[PDB]
Structures are given as structure tokens and as C-alpha cells.
Structure 1
Amino acid sequence: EPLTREDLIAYLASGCKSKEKWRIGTEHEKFGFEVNTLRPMKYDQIAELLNSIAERFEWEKVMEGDKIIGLKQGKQSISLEPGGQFELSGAPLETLHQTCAEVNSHLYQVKAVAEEMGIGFLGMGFQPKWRREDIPTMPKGRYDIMRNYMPKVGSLGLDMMLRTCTVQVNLDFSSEADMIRKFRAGLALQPIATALFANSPFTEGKPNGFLSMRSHIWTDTDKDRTGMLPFVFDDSFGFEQYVDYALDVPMYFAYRNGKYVDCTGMTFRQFLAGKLPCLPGELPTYNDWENHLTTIFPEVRLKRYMEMRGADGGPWRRLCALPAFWVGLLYDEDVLQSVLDLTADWTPAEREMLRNKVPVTGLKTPFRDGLLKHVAEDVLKLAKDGLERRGYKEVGFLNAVTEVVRTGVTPAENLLEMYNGEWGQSVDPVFQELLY
């Protein structure tokens, strides 16, 4: 009995969980580099790193052919982005104390192997030193397919793939109503998160004119699968409408017979009808749908959980702060409403503007009769309220962004200040400044 559109809707809806079952999934990506040369870490070094972590700390190996590309341990996964960015996808955890302990565990295991390899890790949103052609490409079929497709849909998507790092958080919803509310809160506030975590002002050894070049890159990666999703704020919005959106987003690939088939320029509607030209007659599974859902990259993404996709990679205290920010805003029901009331009369154009201007000016971005800084003050207060109300003593995790909001000065701006003062207008010291 083949899958239908209605099944695809139900798949998203099956993510619905009672408040007591809500968890926090935190993912972050890091640039590996040779300590002596600063050169980006190569696949051969990455494979040694993965193999050694697996043996020392009891992880299961994830393979593509004879190539190790990741690790699994319970509900944690370690994986590789296209330019070797080294990712932890954490477990679904109950508290942010557990989240930060999980981040520390990972950083410890990584460094315990990498140190004798002469390898360091950098927490930034965009690779500050090296050109696109300097970046190692990982031996993964799905990335080869994507690398070929990116140039067809934008100028900066290859930089997304090879030269950016994010920290994100994955969160749960209890119902469609709850999902709609979190999606709208998450989208309206995403540019505030982008500003607070902005950490990518350098390209190839110089300032690039941005505070988050990473966030900027996502505005010219591919228009079919990015952005602020204004339709989410339409009264019609719901699981059904997100499915229709996703069905309109062209496919990258389908996994069949052990490998990723290039299905670029094709649609999941074709797949549903058994009429994918890359796979004539094959019918999709839930895994196929899940796979397709994971090729969509808006500022907030929906699957069986919701992803806040807004934020630059950063040092460990910000890795623990990102999930804390969103937990406080979205996991307290009153605070969630407060965000909705705060952002209720924001127009589609205003949201779009904030998303587009924040990468340049961060919290100094003008907004109405003031700066984005003033809105960030209100939102941070709310985030702290929600952590306090959770009763787990998690509010100290927002310490790492309290000073940013207070001063209106982003992390990227602090880096630029060092670059111009103490660093003698070189980015090389950032590899010590932001070393894990």
C-alpha cells in the first residue's frame, strides 16, 4: 500500500509529544585545523580521529564503503559536513546541565585524540582564513551530488557546504497548535539569535563586511529551500501546508542499493507516483521522506521535531547558551505566548528585513523607533524567565549572551576589535582565541 500525501502529513504529526516527554537535542559543527600550519584538517586525519575516538571511548563506526564518515553511541552521532566540519548531534536530553555535560564530554574526547595528532578545533561560523578551493571535500556521495547542484541555484551554496559551522537545537511540540506557535515564535526571533551568536566576520584573512557571513551565505544558497517562510504566518498554516511546501522543494537524491542516486531537478511528487526519472517505478518510504525533509534548510526547519537553524558556531559556553536561549523562549507556555505577543504585529517585510540586515549590523540593526538591541533586551529577559520557571537552575547558561545584549556588541564585533588592535590585522590569532 503506497505512501500518500496524507501519510507524509501524519509523519510530521507523529512527532507530537506530551510536555513531560519534551527533550533538547543540540548539534554543533567545528573546523579542524593543523596547529602548526593552520591548514584545514584533511580526510585522512579525520578518519584517524574518528577511528581513535571509536576505539578509546566505545563508539560504533558509520561507514560509506570502506570510508569511515561518522560514529554512533546510543542516541548520539558524530558526523562530517562536506568540508570536514566535525559534528556532534547529541542525545535528546531533559536538562541543559545534561546538554553542557554532553558538549564537554565530546570536546574532551576530541581533544584527547587530536592533541597528539597536532590538530586543533575552531569554533566559528565561517572559515576565517582559507579559500573555497582550499577546503577538503569529504568522500560522501550525497555531498558530491550537492556540490554539483549548488552552482545551478546560487553563488554561495558551496560556501555553505564547505566553509560554515552552526550550533543548533532540536525541540519538541505537543500538537499542531503548539507546532504552529513555536514555528512562528522561532521564525520571528531567529534573526535575534543570529545577531546574538554572530561569529563570522572574516573571509580569507580579512574582514568581509559582515558580522555573520554564515547567515548571509544562506541567502544565496538556494531560494527553493531557505529563508523566513512567510506562509508559516498564514492562518492556513499547519502540518499539511508544510508538507505541500516540502513537496514543492526539489529533491537532491534517493538512497537505494547502498548508495545515493542523483535526483536533482526531480520532485517527491514524482517519487510518490513511482515516476522518479532517477529511479523509475520505485515508491518512497518514510525514510525517503525523512531524507528529503533533511534537504530543506529554512531558518527554522520542521520534521518530527523543530530545529532552530539561525546561529553561528562558537566556543563552548555559546554551544551551551544556544539551546538554553530557545528552551527558555519555547518550553515555557507563558513565555511562548509572550514572544507571540511581542512579535504579533511584525510584518512579513519587517521579518525579512531583520533576517537580511542582521548579518551586516547585528544588534545595531535599526528596528522601528530603536535598534534590534532593545528587542533583544526584552527577549533575553523572557528567555531567563522561562529557564527560571523550569525549576532546573539552568539560567546561568545565558550568562554567555547577557553581556552581548547589554552592550549591543556581537561576538563577531569583539573579534573585529581584536583583529584591528592586538592581532595586527591578521586572523591567525583567532585559531588560538577560539580554540576548543
Structure 2
Amino acid sequence: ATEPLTREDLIAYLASGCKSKEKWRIGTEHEKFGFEVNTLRPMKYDQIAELLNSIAERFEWEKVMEGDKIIGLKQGKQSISLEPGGQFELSGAPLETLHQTCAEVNSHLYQVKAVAEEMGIGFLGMGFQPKWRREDIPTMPKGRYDIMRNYMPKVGSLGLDMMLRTCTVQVNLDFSSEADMIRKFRAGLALQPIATALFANSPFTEGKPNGFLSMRSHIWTDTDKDRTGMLPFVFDDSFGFEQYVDYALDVPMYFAYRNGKYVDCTGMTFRQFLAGKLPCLPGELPTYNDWENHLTTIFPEVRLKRYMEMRGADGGPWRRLCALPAFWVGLLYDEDVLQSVLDLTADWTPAEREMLRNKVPVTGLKTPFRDGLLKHVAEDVLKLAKDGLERRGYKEVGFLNAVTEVVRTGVTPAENLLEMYNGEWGQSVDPVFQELLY
């Protein structure tokens, strides 16, 4: 039946994510670099397809196909997918506690290694591929990524590196109202540079130090200015679901999915789409699934759909995969901690937030901020996050042990790798493929 969507419907779609506190869940996604253990070469698509087929067969996953190509797996509310450079991704189910989150991570790592060991394949938990050049990375046989690869050079010089050479750990979290959403969004944006610093894990490029602690985070500043960043309008009095929808309506599209394929709609807006005026699909009107797809092509430091996504942290070893969601659950899921965070960050200017975002990639917790170091803010933030987890009552506070020494010493994971590179590793990155081996 033909019943066109309006902007008002798009607003209501986001708002439809509201849920009461007792239904709030924790969704965790992470990406990993696969490599051949003996050559350290990136895992190619033929090896990826064997890995996926074996996982499906052994562990009962449904195969996700694009044409005649396996590109992912599905089992209940979990998915395994591929990033543009073959980075191997788990999107976990919405879970109630971080004990469940970490068991989900462990189950995945067991299944992957159970198959990959016989194949001579290992997985690396870092934010940026430390050894190989961009043109050494295999590309995935996915139509949507072909469109994106062709567009990236038009809007930045590092977007192809984002696609091919970066890995993240992220957390998805729920809101209960527009007021709650706004508060969470503001807390999440303001504190995102702190997450980035604590999880900074990408100091190598092409076998050498790149001069950054999170090269991955820097990459996101020269990807696409239209769909990235610290979203200053979120801190405007006017902000709400409607202001986010207008933002998103004017972010240019990548594609529209019709008839089993991705149509290139670059340079066009979802506005045009709503009015049936897309030159890629002329006269065609969008569905809620089109809107959801479009929403998934926007890449700010925190993203809004029917839930909220914290996107600032580098991939890392398993204890840090469990720490990242713990960090945000502690801060955002306790009302008093959330208020404390808003209080702490209340007087930070847009230029200050933007400065932290840009400088943290280089200096981490030693980034100057006001009359001290970001480290001192991270101290306060970490104690607050542990307060939040204590009060949840589920005994989850131990999941923050993995970042306690970072905060305490002010020394990022990336600086620990640098120290090994310059010492015991004899200035080769090759030992990182054992050090950060899953």
C-alpha cells in the first residue's frame, strides 16, 4: 500500500526507540584484523569465506549472502559481518549485564579461533593495521563498499584508510525519553575524547611509529566533514529528535537498496528521496528501512538512531572489549552519575571539545586541558563510572580494571606498545601480532 513518509514520521521513528529503564540493554560491536600467522599477511576473502562457512556449520549460524558471496552470519540477535578491508566484526545481542557481554565476546573468540587455528589464521586487536599499506589490503566483494570507495577521495584524504585499515569497539545504549536522550548525547559527546584516550591503540603505520597514539581517531578527522565529528548543535537549546532528523536529512546519501542491489546515490540527499526526486531512483519514495540505512551512513563521535552509539574507541584485546561497554554503562545508566558528568562538562566550550577531539589522537591523557591534563578529568570520570557500576548491583565494576592503570599512570595502551617497539621488539612491529593476538 502507498502511504508516503513525512519528516514527522522520520522523527517518530527515532523517538520510537524510547524505552523504560528496566528494558535498557547493552549492545556491543567490535572489529578485528585477521592475518596469516606465518607471513602476517592480511586475511583474503577466500580465507574469510571458508572461515564463515565453517563457523556456520559447526556453531549453527545462518549464512548472509550478497549474490553468490557469503559476507556474514546471523544467529538470533547476533551478527558477524565484514568491514571493507576484511575486518571481522561481531555485533552482539542486546544484553542486560556486562557479565553476559563478556561471555558473548568470549564465545565469539572461541568459535573464531576454533576454526582459524586449523587455517593458520590469527586475529589482531588494534585500532589501525600496523604493518601493511592501503594497497596491500584485500577488498570485500560488497557493492555498498564499492560505492563508498569511489566517493571517499572526493570528500577527504583518509576515508579509504578508515574503511580498509581501522578497527573499533563500540557500545549501543538505550534512552527513555527525548530529555534522557539529549542528556546522554551531550555526556557521550563531551566524554568521547576521554574514551578515545583510554583506549588509544594505533601508534604504528607501515611498520613504524606514525607520531600518533590513535591514528584511527585522527583518520576520522579527514574522512568526510559532512558526516563526522563532535556535533556542536547537540549542545544547542533547540536540540531534540527533530534537530537530529534535519541534520541527517541534509547529510548526503551513499546508496539506496533496490532489487537486490545498491544504487549509487552519492551527492544526493534523503530530502530529495522523501519528495521522490532522487536522480538515482526517480519517482521512488523511501521506506523506514531506507531511513535506517541512511542513518547508518552517518559517522559522528556519538551517533543517534533508535538507540545511541559510542564510536570513539580503538579496537583492542579482550579485556578492553569488555571494558568499553562497562565504561559507558557506568556513566550513562546511573542517573546521578549522568548528572555528575553533565555538571563536570557543563562549562566546556564548543572550541574546547573540538580541541580535545583533535589533540587527543596525538597526546592522549597528557593532552593539556585548562590548568592541568586530560588525565585529571579521566581520574574523575573513571571514579564516577565505577560508582555507576557499583550501584547497578550486578558486581560489574571489575570490568574497569583494564583501564584503571591507564588512568592511574596517564600512559595509554598505544604508549605501552611504543615502549616495546623501542625496547624489547627491536623496532619491528612484528611482535605485536603475538602481543595483541586473540
TM over 0.5: yes
Cα distance in 2 for partners of 1:91, 1:142 equals: 24
Structure 1 match to 2:147: 145
For 1:121-158, what per-residue CA distance to the aligned partner results, in whole angstroms no more than 9, with x for missing partners?
Answer: 00000000000000000000000000000000000000
Deviation (angstroms), 1:354: 0.3
Q: Secondary structure of 1:281's partner?
A: coil
Q: Name the CA distance, whole Å, in 2 between partners of 1:32 and 1:201.
A: 19
CA distance in 1, matches of 2:381, 2:273: 43
Deviation at 1:363, TM superposition (A): 0.0
| 1-structure distance, mates of 2:333, 2:71 | 34
Deviation at 1:315, TM superposition (A): 0.1
Q: CA deviation at 1:279?
A: 0.4
Give the C-alpha shift of residue 233 in structure 1: 0.1
Separation in 2, partners of 1:199, 1:400: 13
Secondary structure (helix, strand or coil) at the match of 1:148 reads helix
Q: What TM-score results when the alignment is normalised by the length of structure 1?
A: 1.00
Question: Is 1:173 matched with 2:175?
Answer: yes
Show CA shifts across 1:174-198 (max 9, x none).
0000000000000000000000000
Secondary structure, counterpart of 2:71 in structure 1 = strand
Deviation at 1:377, TM superposition (A): 0.2
Q: Which residue of 1 aligns with 2:378?
A: 376
Deviations 1:326-379 (A, max 9, x none): 000000000000000000000000000000000000000000000000000000
The separation in 2 between residues aligned to 1:86 and 1:79, in whole angstroms, is 6
The residue that corresponds to 1:55 in the other structure is 57
- Deviation per CA, 1:57-83: give whole Å up to 9, x if none: 000000000100000000000000000
How big is the shift at 1:310?
0.4
Deviation string for 1:352-410 (max 9, x for gaps)? 00000000000000000000000000000000000000000000000000000000000
Match of 2:17 among 6, 15, 18: 15
For residues 316-335 of structure 1, the aligned pairs below 5 Å read 316-335=318-337
CA separation in 2, counterparts of 1:139 and 1:281? 29
SS in 2 for 1:266: coil
TM-score (norm 2): 0.99
Aligned residue for 1:265, secondary structure, equals: coil
Q: Take 2:198 and 2:365, find their aligned partners in 1: how far apart are those partners?
A: 7
Alignment correspondent of 1:103: 105
Q: Which residue of 2 aligns with 1:430?
A: 432
Q: CA deviation at 1:32?
A: 0.2
Per-residue displacement from partner, 1:277-332 (whole Å, max 9, x unpaired)? 00011100000000000000000000000000000000000000000000000000
- State the secondary structure of the residue aligned to 2:325: helix
Separation (CA, whole Å) in 2 of partners of 1:141 and 1:130: 24
Q: 2: distance between equivalents of 1:372 and 1:334?
A: 22
Q: C-alpha distance in 2, partners of 1:231/1:417?
A: 40
Query: In structure 2, the residue corresponding to 1:432 is in which secondary structure?
Result: helix
**What fraction of aligned residue pairs are identical, expressed as a percent?**
100
SS at match of 1:30: strand
How far apart, CA to CA, are the structure 1 residues paired with 2:355 and 2:312?
A: 15
CA–CA distance in structure 2, aligned partners of residues 322 and 48 of structure 1: 30
Shift of 1:54: 0.2
Mapped to 2, the partners of 1:314 and 1:38 lie a distance apart of 18
Q: Whole-Å Cα distance in 2 between the matches of residues 248 and 260 of structure 1?
A: 20
C-alpha separation in 1, matches of 2:322 and 2:348: 29
Structure 2 residue matching 1:251: 3-state secondary structure: coil
Q: CA deviation at 1:3?
A: 0.3
Question: How many residues of Structure 1 are paired with residues of Structure 2 in the alignment?
Answer: 436
Q: How large is the Cα RMSD of the aligned pairs?
A: 0.3
Decide which of 263, 266, 271 is 2:265's aligned counterpart. Answer: 263
**Partner Cα distance (1:268, 1:307) in 2:** 21
What SS does the corresponding residue of 2:293 show, helix, strand or coil? helix
How far apart in 2 are the matches of 1:15 and 1:137? 34
- Structure 1: any 5+ residue segments left out of the alignment? none
SS class of match (1:106): helix
**1:250-294 CA distance string (max 9 Å, x none):** 000000000100000000011000110000111000000000000
The whole-number CA distance in structure 1 between the counterparts of 2:300 and 2:142 is 23
2-structure distance, mates of 1:292, 1:354: 28
- Alpha-carbon distance in structure 2 between the residues aligned to 1:136 and 1:239: 39
Q: Aligned with 2:267: secondary structure?
A: strand
Deviation at 1:95, TM superposition (A): 0.0
| 1:117 Cα deviation after fit | 0.2
> Deviation per CA, 1:100-135, whole angstroms, max 9, x where unpaired?
000000000000000000000000000000000000
CA distance in 2 between counterparts of 1:135 and 1:242 reads 35
Deviation at 1:420, TM superposition (A): 0.2
Residue deviations 1:201-240 (CA, integer Å, cap 9, x gap): 0000000000000000000000000000000000000000
Once the two structures are superposed, what CA deviation does each residue of 1:10-65 show, in whole Å capped at 9, x if it has no partner?
00000000000000000000000000000000000000000000000000000000
**SS of 2:329's equivalent?**
helix
